[PDB]
Every structure is written in structure tokens, then in C-alpha cells.
Design a protein around this ligand. Structure first.
Ligand SMILES: Cc1cn([C@H]2C[C@H](O)[C@@H](COP(=O)(O)O)O2)c(=O)[nH]c1=O
Ligand SMILES: [Mn+2]
Ligand SMILES: [Mn+2]
Lengths: 75, 172
């Protein structure tokens, strides 16, 4: 039914933001944009760092489905 | 009446020609305002594009391709989106940018959807700011500095909330 994220649980919305940060690190690693993964995990709410690490692993896998920074797509 | 302060993030934009051509909305953020008060009836969605995010665009919003893979498409949220804004006065900073993108995406649905401007009043907060502060810098950041609003990555919802505070200050 409803896709509106604003209408979801606070926890759920909090998760989405951690996902944004986690996927962001994987993105940078894929495009060869310097990033210090450890620093980002730190920035996340302590009760969600475990979630961050799992999401980071998750998004790194998804990265494999996308072109590398050195690929034609980014030429 | 009701006002919806809205903003969007995209895969990028064209320096020349139709700014939206070949690009896509990846985030829509909007906050409702009634009687100069934030009602809390907000709208927020991330969308799966059928293309890659330009690195430059990522530099602005930090929304990764990896993050958008499991998200709905514009087509999937279209009606829920229209139901939400219909009839309201949309307040957008440099409205031409987002309206062009919104109408572009609606046209891709092939549902003969009319131009947003026909079912929503469109207010350009950048135009309002320019009339209010002629010869001054009127970007969202400049306005925040002007009104001494502290906001220590961009986001559609985030930018909408910020524009709402700025707009209220501007029209107070
Ligand atoms: C500021 C800026 C925006 N954009 C695009 C991507 C952003 O998601 C979209 C909306 O920007 P805005 O919310 O700051 O108006 O415009 C660029 O491509 N390059 C830029 O330098
Ligand atoms: Mn904008
Ligand atoms: Mn924005």
C-alpha cells in the first residue's frame, strides 16, 4: 500500500538513515572515492552500529552488480 | 488552504537544454504547513531510477545507486504522491527545477496526467526571496545564514524542512 516513509515507525526511519550511510560507504569504495569506513560506523547511534556493519556488508554485495569507477559508465 | 514545502533529489541535471532530460528523481521530500504551522503530515520517498546517479549528484545528496535498488519506481508512488499534493500550494526553491522534473516523470507514465501547475498553486520561494532581498544571494544556504538558522549532506526531506523554516521567516 503506502510507500511514504514519513508515515513509518521512528525506528524504521532511523534504520533508513543508517542504510543511507552504509550504502554510501560501499558506493565510495566502488567509485574509488576516499572514505574511512570505520569513521562512519562511529558516527552511527551505538545501538545501531551492529546494524550498520551488517548493512555495510549487504550493500557491498550489491556494489558487485554495478560498474566500477574505472568502468566505461564513468568515463 | 494548505501549503506543501517540497524538494527533490535527482540523478543529476543537464547544464544545457532541458535540465531534466534523461535524468530521474530519486527522492521526494515535502512538509505540510497550515496556518503557518507544521502539521506533521509529511511525505517522503526514495525512488529506484533506471540509470546511474552522476558522481556529481552523489556529491550533493549522498544517495547511492546501491541504496536505490530495492526502492519503488516513480510509477509506483505516482498516485500516492499526487493524492498528497493535489490542491495544495507548493512552495519550492527554484520551482522551475523540481516542477520540470515532476512533470517529466508524470509524462513518462503515459497517463495524460496534466501539468502540475494545473492542480497545484506553484510558489517559487527563490522568486519570493529575490523580491524580498534584491541584489542579495538567495540560495537556501544564504537565506539560512541571513536568518541565522543553524544546520550543522543534502536531502529532499531535510531541504524541505529547512526551506519551510526559511519560508515562514520570509513571510512572517
Ligand atoms: C546543487 C546541485 C544540484 N544538482 C542536482 C542533484 C540534486 O539532487 C538536485 C537538487 O538540488 P537542490 O535540492 O540543491 O536544489 O539537483 C546537481 O546535479 N548538481 C549540483 O551542484
Ligand atoms: Mn532543490
Ligand atoms: Mn535538495
Amino acid at each position: 500500500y503506502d510507500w511514504n516513509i514519513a508515515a513509518k515507525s521512528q525506528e524504521e526511519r532511523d534504520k533508513v538513515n543508517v542504510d543511507l550511510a552504509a550504502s554510501g560507504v560501499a558506493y565510495k569504495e566502488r567509485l574509488n572515492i576516499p572514505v574511512i569506513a570505520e569513521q562512519v560506523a562511529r558516527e552511527q547511534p551505538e545501538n545501531l552500529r551492529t546494524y550498520f556493519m551488517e548493512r555495510l556488508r549487504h550493500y557491498r554485495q550489491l556494489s558487485l552488480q554495478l560498474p566500477k569507477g574505472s568502468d566505461p559508465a564513468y568515463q | 488552504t494548505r501549503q506543501i514545502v517540497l524538494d527533490t533529489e535527482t540523478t543529476g541535471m543537464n547544464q544545457i537544454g532541458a535540465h531534466y532530460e534523461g535524468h530521474k528523481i530519486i527522492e521526494i521530500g515535502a512538509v505540510e504547513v497550515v496556518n503557518r504551522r507544521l502539521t506533521g503530515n509529511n511525505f517522503h520517498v526514495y525512488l529506484k531510477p533506471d540509470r546511474l546517479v552522476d558522481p556529481e549528484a552523489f556529491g550533493v545528496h549522498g544517495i547511492a545507486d546501491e541504496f536505490l535498488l530495492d526502492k519503488p519506481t516513480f510509477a509506483e508512488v505516482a498516485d500516492e504522491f499526487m493524492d498528497y499534493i493535489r490542491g495544495a500550494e507548493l512552495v519550492i526553491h527554484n520551482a522551475a527545477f523540481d516542477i520540470g522534473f515532476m512533470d517529466y516523470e508524470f509524462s513518462l507514465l503515459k497517463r495524460d496526467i496534466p501539468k502540475t501547475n494545473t492542480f497545484c498553486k506553484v510558489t517559487d520561494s527563490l522568486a519570493v526571496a529575490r523580491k524580498m532581498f534584491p541584489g542579495k544571494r538567495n540560495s537556501l544556504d544564504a537565506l539560512c545564514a541571513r536568518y541565522e538558522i543553524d544546520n550543522s549532506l543534502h536531502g529532499a526531506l531535510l531541504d524541505a524542512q529547512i526551506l519551510a523554516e526559511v519560508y515562514l521567516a520570509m513571510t512572517g
